Amino acid sequence: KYSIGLAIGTNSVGWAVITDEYKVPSKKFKVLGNTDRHSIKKNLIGALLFDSGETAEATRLKRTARRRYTRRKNRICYLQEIFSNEMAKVDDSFFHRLEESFLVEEDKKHERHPIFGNIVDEVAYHEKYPTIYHLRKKLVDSTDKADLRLIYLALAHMIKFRGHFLIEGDLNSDVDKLFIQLVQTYNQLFEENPINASGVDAKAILSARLSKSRRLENLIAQLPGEKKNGLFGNLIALSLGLTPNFKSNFDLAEDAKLQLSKDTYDDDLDNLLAQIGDQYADLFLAAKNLSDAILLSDILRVNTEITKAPLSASMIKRYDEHHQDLTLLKALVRQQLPEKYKEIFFDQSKNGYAGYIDGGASQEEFYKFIKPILEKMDGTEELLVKLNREDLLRKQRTFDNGSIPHQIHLGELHAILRRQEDFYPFLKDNREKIEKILTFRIPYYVGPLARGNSRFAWMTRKSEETITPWNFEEVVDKGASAQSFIERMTNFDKNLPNEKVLPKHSLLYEYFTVYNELTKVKYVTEGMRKPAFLSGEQKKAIVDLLFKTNRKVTVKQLKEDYFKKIECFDSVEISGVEDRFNASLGTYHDLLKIIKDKDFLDNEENEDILEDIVLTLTLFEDREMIEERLKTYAHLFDDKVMKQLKRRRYTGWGRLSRKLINGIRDKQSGKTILDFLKSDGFANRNFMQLIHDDSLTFKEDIQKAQVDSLHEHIANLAGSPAIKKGILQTVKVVDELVKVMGRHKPENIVIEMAREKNSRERMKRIEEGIKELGSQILKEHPVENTQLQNEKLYLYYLQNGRDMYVDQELDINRLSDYDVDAIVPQSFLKDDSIDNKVLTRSDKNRGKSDNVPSEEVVKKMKNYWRQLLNAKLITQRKFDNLTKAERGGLSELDKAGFIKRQLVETRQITKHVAQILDSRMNTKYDENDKLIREVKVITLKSKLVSDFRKDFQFYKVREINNYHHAHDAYLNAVVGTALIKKYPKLESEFVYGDGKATAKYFFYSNIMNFFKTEIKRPLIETNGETGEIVWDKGRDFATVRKVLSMPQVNIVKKTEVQTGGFSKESILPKRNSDKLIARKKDWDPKKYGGFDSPTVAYSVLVVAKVEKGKSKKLKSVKELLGITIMERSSFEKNPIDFLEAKGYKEVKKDLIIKLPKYSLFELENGRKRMLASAGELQKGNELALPSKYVNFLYLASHYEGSPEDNEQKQLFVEQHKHYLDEIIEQISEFSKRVILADANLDKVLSAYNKHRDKPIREQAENIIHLFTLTNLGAPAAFKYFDTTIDRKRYTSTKEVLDATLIHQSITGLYETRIDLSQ
RNA sequence: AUAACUCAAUUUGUAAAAAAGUUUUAGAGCUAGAAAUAGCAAGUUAAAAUAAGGCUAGUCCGUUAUCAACUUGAAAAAGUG
DNA sequence: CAATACCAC
DNA sequence: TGTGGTATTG
DNA sequence: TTTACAAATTGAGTTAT
Ligand SMILES: [K+]
Ligand SMILES: [K+]
Ligand SMILES: [K+]
Ligand SMILES: [K+]
Ligand SMILES: [K+]
Ligand SMILES: [K+]
Ligand SMILES: [K+]
Ligand SMILES: [K+]
Ligand SMILES: [K+]
Ligand SMILES: [K+]
Ligand SMILES: [K+]
Ligand SMILES: [K+]
Ligand SMILES: [K+]
Ligand SMILES: [Mg+2]
Ligand SMILES: [Mg+2]
């Protein structure tokens, strides 16, 4: 009797019930509650609206940061425990004063001066040590016994702010000496062509505060007859961090583009050194050494022969220059600009020195402020130099200290300990302990050190006791933990669900993959009458001769190095492989290079050992654990080999297990899968065939070996948590609708699923791409990540400022004249992304518009596209489409594919929704044990209904109201059921469950013509076989028109408790305001500042009494109280106690109503409001604009055929221009009844009259904006032409306390209305 | 529709770490003047907190997901037009 | 208790 | 961005 | 801001049920 249509979005689920005749029924629904109304008429169409579901990322970032704060605190507690006994003899309360430093003097229990407890000593300390780095350096370099309090503060400061762990190993690299070392190993290889590095100040040039590319050119400028792209220049450039290409240096064909920071350099070098010899390993090792000193020179800035605290010394240099430069700047301003001294040095709000030190000005904002002040004045030459080096008036706690590795704080910590352990025995005994505090990290592969109460933890303990930094290796089972880290995430073999999947790089796995591909190769020669498989002997010979001697095996090699050499074929045709084999024996060749013993690799006896080695190399990343794991095999290899085996690392897992591949055996033959791949008579069955062949027992054993709530099922799907929220809501809507129809199931369910920060990532692509390109375009044309939101400007930079089709530069200032063009035309592929788009002077030069770009263009541009490809400025997908014309372009089969892809949904996520609905609706089986499909689940793409709306003028204008979501679902049901009714053969493509390309292209291109009267077709469409009427153009269109015109549509905004952060994170200064919230129990915000602006979890209706006046007379009240997220647990634990603590007395416990966000209230004249908060309301009504006005607006506005048709539409608009005044009138009466914003309505009416002179198109476009005044939800600002209309807010919830509260079903069809008059 | 492999891109989920920022206190402001006020000096650092907090007391947990109402019902979850 | 401006996120 | 909290203005 | 890891999914290809 009925079908359901569904429109699934990230913020909405539209739904509709339709009958045979495409009508949506209406029904009386009971109304519960305490009001007049007992029932209500409802149309069976509507839409559920909801806020977006969120990813877990923000939550994880706060969670992991929380753990760092508590562990950092524990670092300090460990330090103080070590100091405790001996500090007690020096200063009873030192650690107490530190802990209470934040407290106001009134609240302090000890003296207010932290370090020494009296003014005179506290003042003297700061005079001698103006920064902690003065103290640090003194304690590193001096031999005097030091005060234990100063020792503590120095150590704590290094342990609390300890630097990063991005460099492995130890650190102790002078650019001067390591530059000579580079020249030396260079002239030892090029006797005839030497470099004279005499007089060259390598120190000043390479450690200069400049951009790598410039320093390179500076250095090279001092070497005559040496260009920056020669070998030596490419070495220096490698040490500066650029991307040098040693290809042309060594006359290669494989591009040796190796950069030191890329984590594949280590293997990029051994790849290059395998091509120029091993005499160049000296040179490229000098290169990385020079890089290490250059990197360190950016941080240390001070000669290491004056101090063992180069870092602290560098901070002191910052302080000293800051001091000297400030004295000069003050002097200069006094003399020359006396009227500006106050602004610069006193006004905190003005980004001068005062705002920089006292206000909110960053280093960057401060430089911008005094830049013209320095330029204007005289005698500021060097201050301007330092400003452009970002080196003027620097603080020492700064955003760029993230560069500092922990090894250099450790170096100072260690030196202080060796200095002072001569006087304090406990520092000698605890030296290593203290060093371990700074140095220890929990490995990422161990996770939280939990004891059974963490849903995130996986680590296991070797013994039950508290873990410390010092007993970690003994208490934590690192091996078991590192293994669980991976194995809790990796797949089991689906065919043998108890078996672990093999490492991707397993030797056995790569044998399987090569043999599986090899067995389906066939060949033919002249004589033979038919292509033949390779035999077992031929496959073994090919593996031994080609795959075990070349990392890759090309078809040419197969023809020439096997068929010519072994079979004596001068010509042969190969069928199972293109260009080169996809599979390869990469690991075999990796280990051959490491162990240098082919016989060992080929000996079957060593198979178990080699699998275990690669497993260790895959499972673990830590070199120490790997080495420990490989020790059982130490006797089999040289110590040199073992050391290389350590460094070999692999990642990734296959999809099959060892047992499936080469363990389970066929009963009759006794052969494994791999056995069959190596030799299978003349049938050469591959893995798919073996596993499905009834004459073997593989299929039987897999069946034998085989072994979730609705919410769990959906949560586990792969997809955005945003769409997954719509999926769950869709299932619940369907459940309710089936119940509404008396538990009868629908005939059909038609589902359509809407198709599915970014600035930073765009800059990153271009920065690294242009650098990989060696281009200077970013220095000639600077950008900021915000400008890259312009599609044309982004493409300009992605194309290195060149035309993508012509091999010419473009002009940045002329992008408005240039074209953005789709590589594969958007008539075929509805791809809007950069991945299918291109910037070109004129799209004419693509070639023909009917296809991919022409061969001529591919020939001209392919090499330039290749560089973009290698720079990651274009993508492999984009390159393949750009070059498709040299592979035949778009065949007629390709075209037909694209057209049916526009109509047939293939997204996995939509199939999952269809599966879920299908398996919930269809549960019975027939006499052959086959599922009975009572309900057909149909999936359509949005284009079908979209084209339907346009061809028959059921236009969508989204901003008029939310009805379009529901109309979409109705149209889905109509078009979907009529489609399969007309063409039941199409069920295969649309219904869930189990030469010619021109006809197929024509078919899907004309699939919807049966709705039409001329393209000439009859008035009534029928199914050719059944003789059943599917569409009647004389009354079915009218019915659709009536549905879209219906005013009452069940739009329901999902009410939701608010969760997340307690409040705005801003830590505000102290204020005399009870809105301030304490940051800790005893931190009275009037003294300490705190938070404000908490988020309300939900509101609560309280009917109670409150004390009034001095005498505290009890007065009855009825009000909404907002329960904040922080207050929620306390309020729900005991509501009455919570409320009485707020001041309420004699609360009517049974009358408390929980009111989450968006709770719906109706007042007078159908006026409705939604709860945004405890103190603010949203608009609750929908403006049901008649269809004739919606269609007029779509046409007049040019919101989105033949010229005559366009002329007819244009004449319709002109003949109906009086609709403008009527639409305004409709907005006015709605607003006067429901919006109650008369200042803004008066503004609007005034503005509408102001522009009645404007063209119709423009007035239509701007009337579209006026509906934000009337839209459901939060008031929002909008513009009518050039007048801005500011939002009118509903800043009181009082009126709602005497209105009718409306509780709504998910569909809104079931209501209970509560009259709050009480 | 499905499976293995190749290449590339994207998305989701987890762990371990860095640097800032902010907040209160500590870095004796000095003169003139009864007073506000004026003139000058000065500034770069540190401690502590970084969701209030919780019990399960761990170097753990605290911002995702899920949520009309009513009848039951401790609660889970059923039922209701 | 309006218009309303600014703020974080 | 959008939108609910806040102090300001009156 | 950085490092380490797993899983789908899309989509151009080879072979199959
Ligand atoms: K005190
Ligand atoms: K030169
Ligand atoms: K500042
Ligand atoms: K500040
Ligand atoms: K600071
Ligand atoms: K291939
Ligand atoms: K590994
Ligand atoms: K050995
Ligand atoms: K939530
Ligand atoms: K939320
Ligand atoms: K990720
Ligand atoms: K609801
Ligand atoms: K907000
Ligand atoms: Mg805490
Ligand atoms: Mg700080």
Structure description:
- With 1318 residues, the protein is α+β, with helices and mostly antiparallel strands.
- The strands form eight sheets. A seven-stranded mixed sheet has the order 4-3-28-27-22-23-24, with no helix packed on it.
- The chain binds four DNA and RNA strands through strand 3, helix 1, helix 2, helix 3 and helix 4.
Give the radius of gyration.
38 Å
What percent of residues adopt helix (DSSP H or I)? 40-55%
Q: What is the number of helices?
A: 55
Strand tally, please?
28
Instruction: Write down the oligomeric state.
Output: monomer
Taken from the alpha-carbon principal axes, the silhouette is globular
Strand order of the largest sheet: 4-3-28-27-22-23-24
Span from first to last CA?
Answer: 45 Å
Distinct ligand kinds: potassium ion, magnesium ion
Q: Would you tell me the structural class of the helices and strands? A: alpha+beta
The biggest sheet, with number of strands, parallel, antiparallel or mixed sense and barrel status, is:
7 strands, mixed
Beta content: 5-15%
Explain briefly what this protein structure is:
With 1318 residues, the protein is of the alpha+beta class. Helices cover 44% and strands 10% of the residues. Among the domains are: 57-166 and 406-450 and 458-476, no CATH class; 175-300, no CATH class; 310-403, no CATH class; 501-705, no CATH class; 758-886, no CATH class; 1179-1315, no CATH class.
